[PDB]
Amino acid sequence: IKEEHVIIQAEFYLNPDQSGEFMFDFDGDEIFHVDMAKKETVWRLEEFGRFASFEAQGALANIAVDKANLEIMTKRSNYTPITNVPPEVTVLTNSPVELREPNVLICFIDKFTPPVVNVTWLRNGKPVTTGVSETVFLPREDHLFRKFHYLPFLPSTEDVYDCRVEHWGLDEPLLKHWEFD
Amino acid sequence: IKEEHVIIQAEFYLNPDQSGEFMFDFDGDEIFHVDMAKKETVWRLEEFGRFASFEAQGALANIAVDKANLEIMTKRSNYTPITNVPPEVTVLTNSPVELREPNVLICFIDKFTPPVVNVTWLRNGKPVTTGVSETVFLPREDHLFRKFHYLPFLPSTEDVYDCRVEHWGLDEPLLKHWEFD
Amino acid sequence: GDTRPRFLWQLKFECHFFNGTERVRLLERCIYNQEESVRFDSDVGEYRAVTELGRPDAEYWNSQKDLLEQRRAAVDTYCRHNYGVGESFTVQRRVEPKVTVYPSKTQPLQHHNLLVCSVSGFYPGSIEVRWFRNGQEEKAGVVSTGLIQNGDWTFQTLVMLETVPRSGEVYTCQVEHPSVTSPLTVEWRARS
Amino acid sequence: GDTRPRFLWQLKFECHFFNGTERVRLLERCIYNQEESVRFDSDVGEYRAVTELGRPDAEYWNSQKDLLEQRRAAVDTYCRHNYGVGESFTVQRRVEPKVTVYPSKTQPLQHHNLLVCSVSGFYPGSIEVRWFRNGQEEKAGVVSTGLIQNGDWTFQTLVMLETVPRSGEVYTCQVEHPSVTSPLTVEWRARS
Amino acid sequence: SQPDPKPDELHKSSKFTGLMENMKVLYDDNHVSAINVKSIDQFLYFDLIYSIKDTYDNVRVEFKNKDLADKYKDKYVDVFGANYYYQCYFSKKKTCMYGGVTEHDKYRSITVRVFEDGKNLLSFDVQTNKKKVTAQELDYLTRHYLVKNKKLYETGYIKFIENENSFWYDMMPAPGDKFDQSKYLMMYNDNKMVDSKDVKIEVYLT
Amino acid sequence: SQPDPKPDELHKSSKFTGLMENMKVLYDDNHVSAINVKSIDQFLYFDLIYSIKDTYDNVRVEFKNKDLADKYKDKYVDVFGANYYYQCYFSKKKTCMYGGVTEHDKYRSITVRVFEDGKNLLSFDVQTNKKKVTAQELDYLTRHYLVKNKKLYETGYIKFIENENSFWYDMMPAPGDKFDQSKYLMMYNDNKMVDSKDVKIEVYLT
C-alpha cells in the first residue's frame, strides 16, 4: 500500500510554559488551529472558512485532558525532562527576486523540540514587524516540530536581512542571512 | 551532571545485505573500525596505532552474535521491517579555498537508516576516484547513522563538483553541488 | 536562558488515506517527550504500549470496551467524515506553477554555468521538471533542490543544469503538474 | 531499486564520562530497527526492557547473575580502562586553529559587507571566536555557522560580521581555544 | 480616550433571538467575589485558578496577556466579576470568568445616570473598599440593579469617566440566536482598574 | 604475471618461533573437500556456508569480494582447501576456510619440481577431476607429500605456471611468535582457478 493523503489532528501541552496547541494538518500544511486565548478557530487560508466550520471550544476540552495526562506521565517517568533538540533554520524567498518587485522571505525553522522558539526578522539590523506573518508549530513523524515565518519585502541592492531564531537547544541566537547577489 | 566525553563501541548487522560493522567512537569521531574482510583493525588516524592496539578478530565474534539476535528479533517482531529515512547531504571544503592551492571537499551524509548508501564524487560530471577517502557509518543518539566522504582537490575556476548520494529513502539520486564563487 | 526542565505531552490522530478513502487507517498516538508511548492502530484494533511507559495506558484503555468501539468506528465517523468535510478545499485544491529559467551568474559564453529552472507556487507537490539540450533530454548535471513545502499551501522547486554554454543552443525547462493538461516549457537561448 | 525489506540490529555500549573519569556511566543498548528494545544502565544495575520486545531479554539476561556482575564492573574494567588506553590521543588531542579574516565580496566601502573569520582545523571543538569593532565587542550581526565536525578529527567554524565598512576602522577576530594560552587574533582594516 | 460610538456601532436587542435571560443571569444577583485569596495554579499561561468557595469551587480567572497572570499569580488579590458556566474548561492540578482582580479604611460610594435618547431620570448607589477597583465590579453592581429596578433584561451602554479618560462597554448581545457567554465576558480580560474616589460612571440606555 | 620474488621478500622459518606444527597441520593430512554440494546460507556477503559433513559440520567458505560468493551461492560446487579452527566465527541460520570452490570424464595427473638454491632433485604426482581446478587444491596436494616425504614442516615457495602466466605463494610463516592461521589461509580467498591439463606447478625450496 502506497498512501495518498494524511490528515493529522495534532495537539500538545507543555510544562512549565503552560502552552497548548490544537491544530489540523493535511499533507504537511495546517488547515486551522484554535487560538486558545481568543477561543476562536483560525483557518490557514480564509477561503477554507467558506467551506467548513469547527467548534473552537472543544479544543480547550482536549487541552485540559492533555495537561492532566502530562502531569501523570511526568510523574510516572519520575520527571524525565525533554532533551532540547535545536532547529535547522533556512531563509529563502517565495519566488525568484527581481529588483524593485515585491517578494516574500521565508524563514523555515525545522527539526526542533520543545515547541517554544523566538524569531525575529532583522532588516539591516533592525527588527521588522510590518507584514510579518508566521505559522504555528507543525508536527513531524519524528515527533519534533516545524515552523515558518514570512516577511513580505521589496527587493533592492540596498538592504540585507536576517532571521534570528532563539531556542533552548542553541547556545546563542542563530542568524540566517539573506541579501541580493 | 554535565558530561565531558563519551566513547561508544557501536556495531550493527543488517539482513538481507548481510553487512556488519564494529567500530569505536569518541565524541563523534571514529577511533577505528574492524575491516570484516581483511579481519584487520583500521585506525581513523595512523598515529592512533602507535598508542594502542585492538584484537580485530573479536569484532567478528560479536557480529556473529548480533546476526543471531537479528534473526531472533526479526522473528519476534513478526518481521517488522525498517522504515527508510533519507539522508541530509551537505558538501563543504576543509578550509577556505584559494585558487590553485590544494584543498579537500567533504560530503557529509547525515540522519539516515538503514546503513547502506552509494556515494560518488563527480568532477564536471565524471566520477572521480583518485584520492577519494570515506568513513564508515558512525552512530547517532537517534539511532540513525552518519557518514563522510572526501575528495582532495586543487581549486580552479574551471571545474564544478557534485556529491551524488543514493539511498533507499530517496526517490532519485541526490546531487549536492560545489563550484568556486 | 531559562534553565528549567520542560516536559511535553503530544497527542496526534492520523487519518491515512489510500485510493481516495477506499482504504483508511487511523493511527492515534501518544508521545511523551519525543518518545511515543502508546497508540491505537485501526489495523490492529486495540491500544498497544509502544514503550514501557504506555503499558499502563494500553492495558487500561483496552479495558474500556466503550472507548475501543468508538475508535474502531473512527475511520468512518472521524476520518472519512473529515476527508469529506475538507475535500473541495484541500484534497481538490490545484495552483499552477510559474516557471522561470535564468543562468546562475550572468556572465559570458563557453564557460561553466548552471541554468536555473525555478518552479514555484504550486499545489499539489507532485511535479516533473525536465531539462532538454536542443530538444534532447538532460539527465546529467541536474542539481535539484527537491520539493520545498513553503508552509502556505504552496510548494517550490529549483532544478539546475550544469551547461558549458555554446551558442545557437536552446535549453528548455519542461514542467508537468496536475494543474495543466499540456506541459509548461520555458526556453533559454545560449547567448549569441 | 532493491525493494526487499531490511531488518537491522545494532548494539551500542556507551561510556559517559564526567569530571575526567570521576563519574562514569555505562549504558549498553539494543536497538531493533530504530527502536531501542533493552538496555543496561550502570546507574540502575540491571537490564530494563525499554519497549515490549526487550522484555524477554531483560528478564533473561537479568537471570544470569554472571553477566550482571561483569557489566556492573564494566565501568572500571571497560570504561575507565579504555578512557585510559586512549587518553593521550583522543581526550588530550589539541590541534590549533588557523584564523583567517576576509570580507565576503571584495568590493568598495561605505556599503554592507560581511567580514568572515574562518577558524579551521582544530580539536577539541570547544572554541570561542569574537569580533571586535575598534577594540569593542560585537554581539550584533554575527552570522555564525556553528561548529563543524569535519570527520577527520578536526573541526572548523565560520563566524561572520555584518559591517558597514567605514575607514580608519579595524575589526578583530579573536579566537580562544584549549590549544593556546593567549588568544589568536586576526585583524582587518577597513579599506582606506 | 476611547471615542464614543459611531451610531451604527451599538448592539440592537431586537436583532437577537434566544432568551436575554442568559445575559441577565450574569448580572441578576449573580457574581463571583472573594476576600484576600492568592492563585492556586494556572491552566494556560494567561489565566489563574482561584480558591473561591462561595458556592463556584475553583474559578478560572482569565486574562488577555501572560503579563496579567504573572502579575497577580503570587499575590493575594480580591476577585469580582460576572462568571459563566457553559463552555468553561480547565484542568486543575466549575466556573470561569475573564475576571478583574485587585490587590491589597472605610466603605465608599459612587454614582451613575441616563436613559432614553438623551434624557436624565435616575440616580444610583454603588459602594466598594480599599486598595483599588475595576470597571467590571462597577459594571456589575450597576446592571445588577437596573435589571431588578428597571428590567434591563433597544440599546444600552455603560460609559466610564475617569480624569480625562472615558471608555464604554456595550450592554446588548450580538446579532444572532446564540449569545456566547464566554465571548461577552472576555471584554473584562484586560484587568481594567479605575479609582473609586474620582470615578464617574454613567448608564446610557435607549 | 606476478613478478618473481625480490630476494628479501621470502619468509624465513628461522625468524619464526612457535611450533611450525600449526602450519604443518593445515597440510599434514588435513583438508576439507566435498562432492557436489551447494550453499546453505551466508554469514556475511563475501562468504558461503557449506554442508560438508566429512567430520567439519558447517564450513564457512570465505571469498575476497561479494562477487565471488554471489557467483557460487546458488550453484552446486566442489570444495577443497586447508581449513582452520581458531578464530573462525560465523552464525548459522566449526571450521572456516578461505576456500576454492569449483563448479561442475577421467582422472588426471599434474607434475612438480625443485630444491636447495637452484638444484633439481624430485618429480611428483598430483591428480584431479572434471569441470576445472584451483591453486589451492594443488597447493595442498603438493605440500601434503613434501611434509610427509621431505619433512617440509629456510625458505620455500610454490610457483604456478599457466600459459604465459606465473604466480607464487610463499610457504613459510611470518617473522613472529604466533602464526595466525586465518591470516595465512586468506591468500586463497581469490578463488584462483587453474587448468589441470596445461598447468605446470613447481616447488621452490631452499
Residue C174: helix, strand or coil by DSSP? strand
Tell me the C-alpha distance between F171 and F203, whole Å.
9
- Give the DSSP H or E segment for F102: strand F100-102
Instruction: Write down how long chain C is.
Output: 192
Tell me the C-alpha distance between F78 and B121, whole Å.
41
E-strand stretches of A52-117 = 88-93, 103-112
Does B18 contact F182 at a Cβ distance shorter than 8 Å? no
From the candidates D162, D163, D164, which should be mutated to test the interface with A, based on the most A CB atoms within 10 A? D162
Tell me the C-alpha distance between E189 and E65, whole Å.
9
| Cβ–Cβ < 8 Å for B164, B173 | yes
Strand partners, E77: E37
| Cβ–Cβ < 8 Å for A91, A150 | no
DSSP F10: S
- Tell whether D93 is in a known binding site: yes
DSSP D77: I
Closest CA of chain B from F90, distance in Å: 5
Tell me the C-alpha distance between E155 and E20, whole Å.
13
| Cβ–Cβ < 8 Å for C161, C118 | no
F interface with B, Cβ–Cβ below 8 Å: 42-46, 64, 87, 89-91, 93, 182-183, 186
Q: Which of residues 48-67 of C touch D (CB under 8 A)?
A: 48-52, 55
Cell numbers placing F11: 619468509
**E200 CB-near residues (< 8 Å, 6+ apart):** E111, E161, E162
Q: Is the peptide bond before C165 cis (omega within 30 degrees of 0)?
A: no
CB < 8 Å to D162, chain A? 125, 160, 162, 177
Tell me the C-alpha distance between D28 and D46, whole Å.
11
**E91 CB-near residues (< 8 Å, 6+ apart):** A63, A64, A65, A67, A68, E43
Does A175 contact D114 at a Cβ distance shorter than 8 Å? no
Tell me the C-alpha distance between B150 and B135, whole Å.
9
In 3D space, the residue among F96, F100, F180 whose CA is nearest the CA of residue F140 turns out to be F100
Tell me the C-alpha distance between A81 and B52, whole Å.
39
- Write out the residue limits of the CATH 2.60.40.10 domain(s) in chain D: 93-192
Instruction: Write down how long chain D is.
Output: 192
From the candidates E64, E91, E92, E185, which should be mutated to test the interface with A, based on the most A CB atoms within 10 A? E91
CB < 8 Å to C105, chain B? 181
- Give the DSSP H or E segment for A29: strand A29-35
Tell me the C-alpha distance between F37 and F75, whole Å.
8
Gaps in chain F after residue (C–N beyond 2.5 Å): 55, 93, 104, 153
**C20 CB-near residues (< 8 Å, 6+ apart):** A4
What number of other Cβ atoms are within 10 A of residue B96's Cβ?
16
One-character DSSP codes across E173-196: --SSS---HHHHGGGG-S--EE-T
Going F62 to F63 to F67 to F70, the CA torsion angle's sign is negative
- Quoted resolution (Å): 2.7
Does E43 contact A65 at a Cβ distance shorter than 8 Å? no
| Cβ–Cβ < 8 Å for E21, E44 | no
CATH among 3.30.70.360, 2.30.40.10, 3.90.550.10, 2.60.40.10 for D93-192: 2.60.40.10
**C102 CB-near residues (< 8 Å, 6+ apart):** A96, C115, C116, C118, C188
**CA dist list (Å): F97 to C98, F44, F184:** 64, 14, 10
Instruction: Identify the closest residue of chain A to E62 by CA–CA distance.
Output: A37
CB < 8 Å to A44, chain C? 152-153
| Cβ–Cβ < 8 Å for A105, A178 | yes
Residue appearing with cell numbers 516533473 = C128
Q: Do chains E and D touch (3 or more CB pairs under 8 A)?
A: no
Tell me the C-alpha distance between A41 and A19, whole Å.
17
- Domains observed in chain A: 3-81 (3.10.320.10), 82-181 (2.60.40.10)
CB < 8 Å to A181, chain D? 105
Q: Which CATH class is domain D1-92?
A: alpha beta
Strand partners, B109: B89, B147
Widest CA span of chain C, in angstroms?
78
- Domains observed in chain E: 1-30+106-202 (3.10.20.120), 31-104 (2.40.50.110)
For D183, half-sphere exposure in the C-beta direction (CA atoms, 13 angstrom radius) is 14
In 3D space, the residue among E148, E164, E168, E165 whose CA is nearest the CA of residue E156 turns out to be E168
CB < 8 Å to D160, chain A? 177
Q: What is the experimental method?
A: X-ray
From the candidates D19, D30, D53, D90, which should be mutated to test the interface with B, based on the most B CB atoms within 10 A? D90
Q: What are phi and psi of E72, to 5 degrees?
A: -115, -5
Widest CA span of chain A, in angstroms?
58
Tell me the C-alpha distance between C136 and A170, whole Å.
48
